[PDB]
Amino acid sequence: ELDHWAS
Amino acid sequence: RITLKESGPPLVKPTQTLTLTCSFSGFSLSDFGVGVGWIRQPPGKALEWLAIIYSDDDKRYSPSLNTRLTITKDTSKNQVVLVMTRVSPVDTATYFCAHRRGPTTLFGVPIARGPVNAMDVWGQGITVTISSTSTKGPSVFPLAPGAAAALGCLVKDYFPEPVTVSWNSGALTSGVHTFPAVLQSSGLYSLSSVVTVPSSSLQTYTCNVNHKPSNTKVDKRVEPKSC
């Protein structure tokens, strides 16, 4: 899944 | 100045539970978006990511180790703990904890996320060995033979590290190669120490082996066999 700071 | 340091047992037995503590200073795990992660490095291998925890308490784990890892924080003690259950020999590695910056803020407003893309400060690392072995001294055996000749000593079946080897009480140094020990499947280490000399010197050669842990000193003179 995506990193804590992605998007 | 940010500093981190790992602590825990240097030795652990298979099936047991390993608890590692990262104590740090220079930041608080209550600071905005900060993270503390754990990374390990088996001897001679690549870095392997294990887990990370942030100040808002979100936790993430390596999928391959998820079932055996628990990471937790103790904000008031400035510590992060990683608990690994059911360890086995392949878990022997140097374990590092590391700081991860949170986004830069301006008047408490997040304006830059680029600084979160790295683990910026690392602890020195703590070496953990997983073996069911009890302390034990090495058996020392001879290794006997451009036109260089080679000989050495095979320092076998000892635990734990380290062992020291020198040649001729320290007088022989040129051409000496003492290799890093390998951890055998038995849980005991083994290493060779060799020395290359002009095929004529065959001069006397004695390896001095010392395993402090078991109080075992051995001097073994090695020669070109055949009586």
Added chain:
Amino acid sequence: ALQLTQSPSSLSASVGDRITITCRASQGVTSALAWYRQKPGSPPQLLIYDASSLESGVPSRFSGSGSGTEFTLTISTLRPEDFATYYCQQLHFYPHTFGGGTRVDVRRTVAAPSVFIFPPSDEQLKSGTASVVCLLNNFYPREAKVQWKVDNALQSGNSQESVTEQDSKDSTYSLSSTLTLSKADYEKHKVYECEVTHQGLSSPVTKSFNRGEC
């Protein structure tokens, strides 16, 4: 999961050279990539964060570029402290993967290994085990392949090897490989061979002995 492949895995160079290490990801990681340098016995040290930002206190000869699936680290003028292993790390997807690393060592002329095979000592045999050791002395580059053969059977899963760190005077490496068998199995065969492949050897060299031959 996501794969990060570094190239080359190993690289030789001299002080003053310009080197560039590259890291490719199996899926795009945007700019969330970091480079580290790790010297023997020390923890990795951050050089470049967010694909191209220079970490504070890191010397300007280090540079990072790229985004998406392809990144590069270049050291413009290699200094002695740069002989080390470099790693890239992706932080876009969990888990936060590391590449396999690229070892940067002192270049020198190719040198084939001097190979030696040692039979097990009679003293070890009396304890019931048999260790056959093979030594590859002072070679370069580091990559070498050792293959044990017993009465022509290819051995597998019963040997272990270790390599010294690059010699500070020679720039060469040495490698020790131990074949381990029970005394019983040992006794059931005659030709113990250590086959060695290396760049400096025109073709593979084999060193061997026949057990018990006296």
